[PDB]
Nucleic acid binder design. Sequence first.
DNA 1: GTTCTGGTGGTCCTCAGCTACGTTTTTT
DNA 2: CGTAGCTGAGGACCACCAGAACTTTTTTGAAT
Lengths: 190, 218, 342, 343, 342, 343, 98, 98
Amino acid sequence: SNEEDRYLMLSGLQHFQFCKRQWALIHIEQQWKLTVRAMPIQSKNLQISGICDVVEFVQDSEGIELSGVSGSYKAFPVEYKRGKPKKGDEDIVQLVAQAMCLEEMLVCRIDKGYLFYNEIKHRVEVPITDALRDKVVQMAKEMHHYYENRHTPKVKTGPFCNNCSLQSICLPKLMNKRSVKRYIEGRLSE
Amino acid sequence: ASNEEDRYLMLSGLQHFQFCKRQWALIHIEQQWEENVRTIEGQHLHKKADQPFMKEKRGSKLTVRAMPIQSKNLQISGICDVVEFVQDSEGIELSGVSGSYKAFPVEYKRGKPKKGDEDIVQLVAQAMCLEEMLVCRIDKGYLFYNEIKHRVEVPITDALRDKVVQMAKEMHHYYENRHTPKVKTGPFCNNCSLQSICLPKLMNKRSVKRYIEGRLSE
Amino acid sequence: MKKLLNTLYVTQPDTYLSLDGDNVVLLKEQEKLGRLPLHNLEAIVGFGYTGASPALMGYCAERNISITFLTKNGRFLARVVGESRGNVVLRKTQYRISENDQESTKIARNFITGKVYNSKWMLERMTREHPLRVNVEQFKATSQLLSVMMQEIRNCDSLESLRGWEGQAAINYNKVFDQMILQQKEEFAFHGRSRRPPKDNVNAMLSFAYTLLANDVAAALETVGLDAYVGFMHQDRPGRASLALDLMEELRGLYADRFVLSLINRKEMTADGFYKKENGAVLMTDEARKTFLKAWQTKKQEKITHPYLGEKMSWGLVPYVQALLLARFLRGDLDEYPPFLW
Amino acid sequence: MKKLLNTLYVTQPDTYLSLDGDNVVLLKEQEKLGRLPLHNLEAIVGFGYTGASPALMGYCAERNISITFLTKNGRFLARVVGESRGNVVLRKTQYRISENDQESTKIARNFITGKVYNSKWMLERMTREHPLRVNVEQFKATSQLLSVMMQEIRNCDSLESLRGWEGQAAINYNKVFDQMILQQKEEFAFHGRSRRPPKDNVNAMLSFAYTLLANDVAAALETVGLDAYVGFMHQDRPGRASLALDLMEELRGLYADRFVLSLINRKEMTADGFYKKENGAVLMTDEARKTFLKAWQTKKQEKITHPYLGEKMSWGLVPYVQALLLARFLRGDLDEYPPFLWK
Amino acid sequence: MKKLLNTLYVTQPDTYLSLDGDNVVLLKEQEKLGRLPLHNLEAIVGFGYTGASPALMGYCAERNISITFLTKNGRFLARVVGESRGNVVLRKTQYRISENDQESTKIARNFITGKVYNSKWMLERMTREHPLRVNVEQFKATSQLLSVMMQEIRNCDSLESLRGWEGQAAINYNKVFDQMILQQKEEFAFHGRSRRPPKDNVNAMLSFAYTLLANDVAAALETVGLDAYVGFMHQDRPGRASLALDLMEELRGLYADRFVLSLINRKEMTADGFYKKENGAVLMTDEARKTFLKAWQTKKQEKITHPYLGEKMSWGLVPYVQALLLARFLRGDLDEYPPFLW
Amino acid sequence: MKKLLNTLYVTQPDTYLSLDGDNVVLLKEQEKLGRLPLHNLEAIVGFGYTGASPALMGYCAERNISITFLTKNGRFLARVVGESRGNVVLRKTQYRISENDQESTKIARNFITGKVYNSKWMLERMTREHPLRVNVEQFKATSQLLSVMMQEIRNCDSLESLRGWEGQAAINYNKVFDQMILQQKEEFAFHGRSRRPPKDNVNAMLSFAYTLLANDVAAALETVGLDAYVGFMHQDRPGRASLALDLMEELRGLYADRFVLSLINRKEMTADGFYKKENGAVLMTDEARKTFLKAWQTKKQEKITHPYLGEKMSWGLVPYVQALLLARFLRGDLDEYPPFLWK
Amino acid sequence: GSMLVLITYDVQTSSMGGTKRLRKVAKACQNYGQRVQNSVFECIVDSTQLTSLKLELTSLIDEEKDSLRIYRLGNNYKTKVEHIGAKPSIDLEDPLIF
Amino acid sequence: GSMLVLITYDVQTSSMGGTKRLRKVAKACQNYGQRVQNSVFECIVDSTQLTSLKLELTSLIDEEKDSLRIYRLGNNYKTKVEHIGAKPSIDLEDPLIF
DNA sequence: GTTCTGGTGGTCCTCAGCTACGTTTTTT
DNA sequence: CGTAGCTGAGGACCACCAGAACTTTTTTGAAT
Ligand code: SF4
Ligand SMILES: [Mn+2]
């Protein structure tokens, strides 16, 4: 009756949008209105836990009732993620993940999302659709498949690899090598 | 030329003439002077050694520094760095003390020994000046170089004296002509202190005609 | 080959200058605005009632630091001159050449060659990179007119007639210079010359630019060791810095006029910058003065390559090096003095 | 303070200069000392660490008056002037005449006649003062010889010949130079000329004195725009003030030799201040040099009359105005340069 | 990619170490001897009687700063080992690899291959530079034999056999090693690679080099998160932290022996610095030990390249990377551990 | 101090361990406090911000005596050791047993037997001292249920069956624990059990005490040489010390829950120093945490007698001793691991 | 790149938080480096350690009352550093045989 | 040219002529560069001026009692200096209008 | 208006010294 | 023993205050 073991952190959802091997490097090898903050949020169908950064509960007639207070409120998510707006949707995944976790907590649907840009100090608005949630479900089940097998994957190095702090552990150059067989025959010849 | 003593040239111009013919022209015609690292350090050495009005004797010998000495054969005047007087009954008695002493001129510089004559020339000329004051003959000369902190001996020969006489006459002629010559550039002028003046880069190149005519035509 | 030291411009009135050790200190009734090391300065331009103790004047004179006084709008109120050096042969040769008309006529040939070439080059560059917004055909026609006149002026042997051709060439060039109103409204239109009164716009800036260029040309000519009061051009009117104007002639075509035109097209200034009293000609403000000085100093740090010397140097080092090329020619090194053909 | 030939002088240090209305005003730490006009002046010469008033400079420069700031001892510090600079035609005419023989020889003969004029009445005056211990007949004979050479050089026009009578007159004055000594003859003796490495005591004195004079007279020409490095009788050579030496000749006797005589006769200095050199040369001592300079400063403050004008002046101002006269000779109505004919 | 850091050899006896902030302070009866920052100090080595406060041991151990105590003449005592920083999967895989002969013999194959390759090429190079002082032919023959060993070393699958082959690798080299020396053959009385733990001269230096290399390699392996001194391939017989010796078998032949040989050839120390005890043991004088340590560190600082890609690294990083590669072998990155081969 | 098993557990802080002959001397600031032989000692464990004599550590490092240094609170710092002694065999055996399942099941059933024995005896005691206002026959029925739990666990043989039968007793423990609260029952209750964001204050106190005891047991497991992140009952997980949680499930009775109950009773804490923020989590205040830690230290300083060895000691040493026996099980010196058992 | 940097502070002791800020900045900079002169510390750090030191040290000092300057020389610092007096320093590339 | 050079000095005023030495050193060093903190100066010089200053100082101070350090930051000094507090220094290469 | 010299005083700066303590639910 | 909190006791260090003063040859001096 230990349901705690099968639950992971939400932040690990980010690293499958960038340098897939980094997730195995950190989580596997273990090497390094109301404006509520720090919400522990868990979801069972997708089986993931985490902490939502900011939730804004806004009063409206057509909202959803909250526990302990009568009425109806929306629970818009706000996350502080610095950087420039980027095409590889590395930050929208965690937004949609926590949004759908909160929605699974209440069994309903919303189509609004807030995000913070610290370096530009920008408000950005994002709706969500089925094309994102299906990809999230597939990515989450594939993550479970990887985690339960204790398997470290291999990915293309890319130009970004001069930025991952694990470049002394990730060892990017061991992707396209001649293998030890070429070393063996070279030492045989010489 | 009030009494023919006004037509006296500097000893210091000899070395400049020997190295860069225009450098001596620059220093002693247009009265220019610019300093770099080496010349500043050398000047500091000279002023540190420029401490008159004291004498040290070790029982037999004595030293004298900053001597105003002139020679009429070349009509050249200047100041010597050091001369050492040694106790021996061979020279002529000198004023200021008793007994017979012999003279040996030594000057201080900061640098490696030079492949050319250059520095030694000065002492050569220096020797001549002394032989015109004490009425004697000198065939031995002394040097100290500070960069290696080392003592170098030089003899005195008549070929050197003749060469000094020749260059003295030539530089008298240049002074009377008020003429600045041209000399080969080479890698000489990278510590040539007056480099931003005697503009050696412009000598070896083409003249003014063709450049302006070409740029005017096209 | 030098460093192009920085320059100091004092604008606050009733400022007093003192010397302590080797540092220049600005005071205002025992309240000090600051102190600077003098081993980084070349010129000090005082504005208004700027009193300088004699010791500062002497110290800056013996180390070739030029001090100039202007009251409010860059006039010729005064300069500062020091004592003599051992450059007797240079001054002697300069006077001897000035006495003879012929060598002066070749020098004038070279100066007017610089005139014509730099003018034609600047106007053809203006015409080339610009569409029908500019009068391309008339500019090119004036270019061929100048190109025709340049051969004739290259072989002149008299001063009065050469003055005639340079005057007519200046009129011809002004006839096309009267058009530069591209990116500015009509209130900044050139409407003739006004020597004493800055009656209109632009010309008020022109006077300040001319003063600021002349006070640097004079400083450079004092730097070289030459005496700049017997001109090789113009009639030798006694009591004027003749060679200052003589040398700044060829610089006038690019050093200040082009900067002002670039400022006007870039609209770095606005019509409200200049104010007028009852007559007052046209007056500039403290903000206008600060902006002009900042832009001037910023441009002076630009880096170019000299055509004849073929070396990379700061643009603000045109007037010294150029003047330096004269001194060697006074020793017979070259056959004639080279112009500026940028 | 004192105005002479359209020029203003200031001699007392620590005295500010300002402008009131159209007049110059002398001040001394908020004490008013004098007020003078400005309408007809030409230039202002100052010797104080004053600074003046900037409005004064602006107005004077706008009216074509050049101000010249010096030090309290007589160096050159700065020349604040508008576009006129003071001298353009003056300097160009000086240089044009510097290459011509007749006018240069005229100026030369003026130099010779004035200086030997002064020298021979100096000999006569010292003979009159001291008949007891002086063989006055020899000095009288030299005086008649000097008068003869006066009359003979009054109509000469060749440079080298003038150099010749310079040589003979200098030799005669040397041969009479020995005898004006009257005290401490034991070691203070004169036996010829040694400009380079000085020899035999008193010689050194003269040389040093001469040097000072040059600087002083140099400043004089600097005040008037005359070049101090291009001489008329002397030839131009780099590193030497030819024209300063040319003008220094008259002032050599009274202002240098009489000065050293007044120093020696009063026992101001002795052999203790002179150091010896191994080759026989004589050198100077720091305390001796400072005392010599203090006595020189004391003598510079003496007040005498000017023979040519009569206005009272101090010694320190004499070389300047005379050079001014030479400037006025180059551009002016003066028939001939007036020498310092002083008795 | 990592940066090499210093060490710290405390030679004065009767000392004490202490922590203060992030600094180590060297104390000796309440008068300080120095203070050093702890972010550029990758090891601490004690000599004689040294102490440490438990706070210092904890901080160093949990921040990968190895302590080590030695007595008088480099006798090992009481290394300091801290906590287990995790990485359970790598440790489990390593422990599973042990007790199986197949993979153990594979890794032994690679290890012995590296050792023999290094010895052969070092000998070949030596006879290549200067042949006049040595007998070339014998060396050549030995190389041939060593080459054959390669095949056998690759063509085996039992740990017992390779161990036996080890003996042959000892008997072919030891006799040769005598003529490695070129100078001081009389001063440095040398009896082959024969060793005596009581020491017999020209063995004190070799023992010192072995001790220092062992400490460095043990720290490097414990940094990566595994253990290979009592591990899979070497013998289990206790009291011998010698799989670390087995990981440095490819190094002790090159890194330590070549260093000692260069030290002998270059006359860097002489027999004056050595002495012998009454019982027959030999000791090194203090100045000799200081000079030896200076030579060791200065050698460590020098930069070389690697056979894999050519990336630059110093000497001291050669052990550490050799540890890291091993872990990367156990994560499925490489087919088998690629050894160190010059 | 010296336990019968050959280890030293010096616990008095500010104590210097020095060597005299072949013996250990404990000095309390310059006074000879204690003396003990070293003939058969196996390990020395020292508490407190203290030191050790360099000679002593050098001497002990030779004869296979590892010296472990822990601070006076219970955090584990260092282990001075020569070549590692008695650790590699323990670690390899631990990993081998972890890979296996039957021995792990035996160990897990032993742990569960200890837990249920502790719970049953605590319930019997509680119904003994205060049979006044409590459901008593229900407690006897729970005791017989715990006895059938005894029987099933001691003849249990499957991992899943062991986990399920462990979970079955947990709920009965939960209701009886809610029944335990006697004093201040009105405001503190155990209506439910909350792990994630513990609702109700008792759950938060339980989590806090569990965290403290888990950290202490982890230090206990590390100080003897066994890895804590590989377990026998729980499965593998990174960042989780499974064997520590096994010892938690054994010892979460007498030493953990009684502390919280005694804190609730005796009026040693009020609800004012407790918070409630929007979900049921109780954010402890600073003063309450200070008092909690002080009470924890005071209880750690209590004196008892070990049921198995029979030797007097403190509570703080109880974890370490337990872990040591586990090591003695894996090394082969013992047949079983009784935490609290008759056998 | 593990380069040399130099840090100089100057904290006012007159204000309310003078002594405490002085003591805390001195002790919070002595950790990362060494004292070569009073108020002049020099250290050898990479980019990350220096960034952490800057962020940690910009909070102890108080702006509008104190001054703090950081000068970075470079990895080739052996040629751009000179000591002429009589307070010798200890380098951190010495083998350090104490 | 015109490299930036930073000079620091710590003289001993407990000596016989400490006060005199400190005053002389301060005045001598002030002639070439600015002051940013007590006992530190920043200046913009070339090799010639640096040599002159170095000889002046080493002739001015005594050894065995005082310390003096010199640093040269090269030609790119603009992008290597960072400032936090409230003691600004006037740069000598900006247009410099008062 | 500058240079140098004593002399004073109030602000930075580090070391020596004495008192009083030492534990926290587990996020990148 | 290590981490903070406060003292206290000398050194470094710069801005002022008051006072006395304020002048000197002509010659050497680098070059990877
Ligand atoms: S830098 Fe490259 S190798 Fe390293 S974690 Fe990122 S993607 Fe993987
Ligand atoms: Mn010499």
